[PDB]
Amino acid sequence: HVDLTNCDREPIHIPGYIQPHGCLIACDNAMRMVLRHSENCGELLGLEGDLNGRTAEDVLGKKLVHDLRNALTVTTRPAMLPAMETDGRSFDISLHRYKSTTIIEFEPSGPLGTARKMVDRIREADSVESLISRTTRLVKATLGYDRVMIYRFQEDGAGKVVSEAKQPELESFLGQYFPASDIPQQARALYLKNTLRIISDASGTRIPVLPAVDVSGEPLDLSYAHLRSVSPIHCEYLRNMGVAASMSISVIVDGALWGLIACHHYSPRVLSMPVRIAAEMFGEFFSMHLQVLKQKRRLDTINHAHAALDRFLRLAAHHANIEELLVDSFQDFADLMPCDGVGLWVGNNWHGHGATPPHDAIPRLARFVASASEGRVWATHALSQAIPEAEIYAGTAAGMLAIPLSQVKSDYLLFFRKEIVQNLNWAGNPEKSYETGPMGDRLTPRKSFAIWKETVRLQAQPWSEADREIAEAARIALVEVAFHHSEHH
Amino acid sequence: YHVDLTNCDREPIHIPGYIQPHGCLIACDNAMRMVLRHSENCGELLGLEGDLNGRTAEDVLGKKLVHDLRNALTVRPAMLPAMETSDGRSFDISLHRYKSTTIIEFEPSGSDAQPLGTARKMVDRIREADSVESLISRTTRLVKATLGYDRVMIYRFQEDGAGKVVSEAKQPELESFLGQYFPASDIPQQARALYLKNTLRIISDASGTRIPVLPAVDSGEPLDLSYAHLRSVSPIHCEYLRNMGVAASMSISVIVDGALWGLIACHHYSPRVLSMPVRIAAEMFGEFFSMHLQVLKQKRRLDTINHAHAALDRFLRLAAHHANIEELLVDSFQDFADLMPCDGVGLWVGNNWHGHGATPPHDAIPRLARFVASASEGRVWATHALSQAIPEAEIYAGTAAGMLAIPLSQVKSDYLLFFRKEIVQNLNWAGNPEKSYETGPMGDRLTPRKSFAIWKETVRLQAQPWSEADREIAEAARIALVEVAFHHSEHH
Ligand SMILES: *C/C=C1/C(=C/C2=NC(=C\c3[nH]c(/C=C4/NC(=O)C(C=C)=C4C)c(C)c3CCC(=O)O)/C(CCC(=O)O)=C2C)NC(=O)[C@H]1C
Ligand SMILES: *C/C=C1/C(=C/C2=NC(=C\c3[nH]c(/C=C4/NC(=O)C(C=C)=C4C)c(C)c3CCC(=O)O)/C(CCC(=O)O)=C2C)NC(=O)[C@H]1C
Ligand SMILES: [Cl-]
Ligand SMILES: [Cl-]
């Protein structure tokens, strides 16, 4: 009995049910004997009686067993076998082996070409922004879903809606965030393991797997089964939205879950196997192209930083007073990385530009970095957790990155970021409200957004590994300025 | 016009006026309405009665085939295997438009597997390669075993455009070229341009009777065969191949950062051509090989850069506990040899030398330090040609032909110096010095023995160039050492 108290640990990989848009047979490892079957196998495949204890050869016939045993060699990911002949009827068959069990999934029948056409419309994108923008538009028109979104996962596991294409009558979620808890760890693991997650009907009656628990007390692990049933938590969430069906394409960068291409329909919908194969091929190209553009943007940003710091080094060689040059120059360092403010703290004198803590606050911050830092870059996105008094000015500066200008003096170049809620660009309608089921308003985008805001209260956008690399290049450039100055003075 | 060794550097190999005899070529107007030119062998190969120039493409090829070819041109040349011609027979057709001309190329169809299946099997056998070395090593063995050529080599182009043979799979009776180099002049610029433009270059027969394109000149214009796979071969290269005993070849161009990284060169000692479907597979393999090489290269660069940073960070922590930085460096300098490929390293501080490995003699260092001082703007200075900067350095070029200097001060001419031997000293050539080659009318220039001798002369007194990676690591070392000096001054 899953509810909001235990849905974080719901065993969604072993639900004991499938979705009604196909049927499922579980065989032993050698595909000799039928061990389990979905209750709808008789109806869909035209079979009579309890299929359990019948041979694979009996239930499937000599030909299909021969063909499926061969395909099981290909087994990586599940083998997708569209348009397989049974009675001379056509079934789209998915076949995999996991936990010493052969799972065979059947759909009544109805790729390179569709895939090639989609990939040709994104392969010329030359920015991450351009790729993610055009992808929702392209997937929506090609796969025919009412809404297509892209989420980018944040360092804390929250999702941000970074792209959206939708029917003009729908509310917008663009620029919205949801908390990490909206997608539990087992769901994330399954998104990482499977390219596609299909939900044909959020109000479809689940079909039991017979048996749910076998004679040995083992549940059936449906981790790689596309027909695997959906948490009633998530089904209630979609029903509250008015969503009736979904398909997600997992975006994998550096072997990790970067985000999802989330396709939502406001009526039941399932794509044929051939179209899903195309969507999966599109997903792999999207992921690779995203990873290529992301590397290029990083390289350009690091190179920009180096060229700016080299200009500063050449400039500084012609200056007898380094403190004066920095007082005149420090605001230009704001261009090195995303920040809302920058400041110079040298000889107990403060110079601020943009959104910073007030001069009164800087001694305490300088003191804390001196204590906290081992002479290297020190950075936090949650100043109030380090310095409670920092809560007062969290609206202006919730995040700080500190570059030491000396190992002897408590002098710093300080970068600041606003509370992340202050930089929101949400396209949504705060008047749009949602109906709820027995679990209450927790399972609504409105409440999800409110919960996210509570989790980032008094916090800024985290300092990226790139921001930290740029900060280290700046620390080291400034050491060099100081050294060359002492060499000649 | 006759090509020879004085003008082969500018031979117009894109407009030879001939094709190779393993197919035939029809050139049409941009709309594929009219036949403008044809190879002499079109008559024999396609079974066409009478001169073709002036006829409609539909009259020559039939309405159905021209319809399909028009469609293919609507949807790199188009590779169309097993096309049915008007007389029932199957032809592998290559189709492209260039310089307002449609070029149709024909080969008799055989029996072939789907290219994608062939390509996938090859790709599956290199995709698990986790180093550049493992990829380059296994690729010549795999390609030879798949395509059935007598020799498969990989060349890597050097900074000066020279090729190095970095992988080889061969018949056991053949001479080895592994670890050999050839000078840049062995592949002229227009040949390089065509290796960049075309993934595959096919030579069916290095001694084969050229088939004329009729007419060779139309308006005075020759037929541009830049993208035609049947384009004939320079007499110079055919003579080179005949001298080697090579009768046929196929090269797969390796493209990295939109530049020609190298070739997978397939050589046969008897006339040989692959079917179009196996050539499509070879092209798909080449594309995958290029991408996987780039991924392995990126990981190897990142690992060497991170290894350098980790080592320089250990040194910074170490130095913080040392009152005497000069002494620490005297004790430590040899460890810096581990940052980048080098044959020697030394410390020049306070007119005192300490050397490790292959370095100039102690007496040579003051002249080198003085040179860097006058030539450097207080940043890293590096050369692979010391004697070109300092004539005196020729004396010790065997030991040290290349130097990368890291300045330790802006007010004292103190350096950490890295050295590389003359490149011929680090040669790992698997070849037979007693293997000799017959020659044609152009003489022994067109032989591997003389190619290698010419290369050796182009790099005499020179080392392996310092890579962009080596220079990035040197700059991290310079900066780390500035930081050691500064923190020393802060606390002392
Ligand atoms: C305690 C467990 C909860 C839970 C579980 C599951 N969520 C799953 C998928 C899922 N949930 C959401 C959340 C959203 N928040 C929004 O603000 C919003 C829209 C504006 C959505 C849709 C998302 C985004 C997803 C990802 C799929 C998609 O986008 O379509 C999930 C997996 C379902 C499956 O098996 O396919 C589980 C389990 N959701 C909760 O809210 C909680 C409390
Ligand atoms: C002045 C022009 C010259 C010239 C022209 C061409 N060379 C072409 C191809 C070619 N040439 C070589 C050279 C080699 N040097 C070796 O030492 C060696 C073997 C040990 C070889 C084979 C190479 C490597 C190649 C690349 C193709 C291959 O390796 O199979 C060329 C293009 C031919 C074409 O149309 O396909 C031209 C033109 N070669 C000279 O030596 C000079 C003087
Ligand atoms: Cl749209
Ligand atoms: Cl990103």
Author numbering:
A (entry chain A): 7 to 81, 85 to 95, 97 to 120, 125 to 503
B (entry chain B): 6 to 80, 86 to 228, 230 to 503
Authors' own words:
Agp2 originates from Agrobacterium fabrum and carries a biliverdin (BV) chromophore. Phytochromes harbor a methine-bridged tetrapyrrole chromophore as a light-sensing unit, which upon light absorption undergoes a photoisomerization at the terminal methine bridge followed by a cascade of structural relaxations.18−21 This reaction sequence interconverts the parent states Pr and Pfr and involves proton translocation, which has been shown to be a prerequisite for the functional secondary structure transition of the tongue, a phytochrome-specific peptide segment. In the present work, we have generated two further variants with ortho-cyanophenylalanine (oCNF) at positions 165 or 192.
We determined the crystal structures of the Pfr state of Y165oCNF and F192oCNF variants with 1.90 and 2.06 Å resolution, respectively. Structural details of the ZZEssa chromophore geometry and rotamer positions of amino acids within the CBP display a very high similarity between the oCNF variants and the WT protein, whereby F192oCNF is virtually indistinguishable from the WT. In the Pr-minus-Pfr difference spectrum of F192oCNF, the lack of a positive band in this region confirms the shift of the tautomeric equilibrium toward the enol form. Phe192 is located in a hydrophobic part of the CBP. Accordingly, no strong H-bonds are expected for either pCNF or oCNF at position 192, which is confirmed by the crystal structure (F192oCNF) and the structural model (F192pCNF) for the Pfr state with the exception of a H-bond in the oCNF192 backbone to Gly173. For the sake of simplicity, we may therefore classify the H-bonds of the protein-bound phenyl substituents on the basis of the EF,tot,HB values as very weak (0–15 MV/cm), weak (15–30 MV/cm), medium (30–45 MV/cm), strong (45–60 MV/cm), and very strong (>60 MV/cm). Both F192pCNF and F192oCNF reveal only very weak H-bonding interactions because this residue is located in an essentially nonpolar pocket as shown by Pfr structures. A strong field increase upon Pr formation is also found for F192pCNF and F192oCNF, which is, however, accompanied by minima in Lumi-F and Meta-F, respectively. In both Agp2 variants carrying the nitrile group at the ortho position, the noncovalent electric fields remain largely constant during the photoconversion.
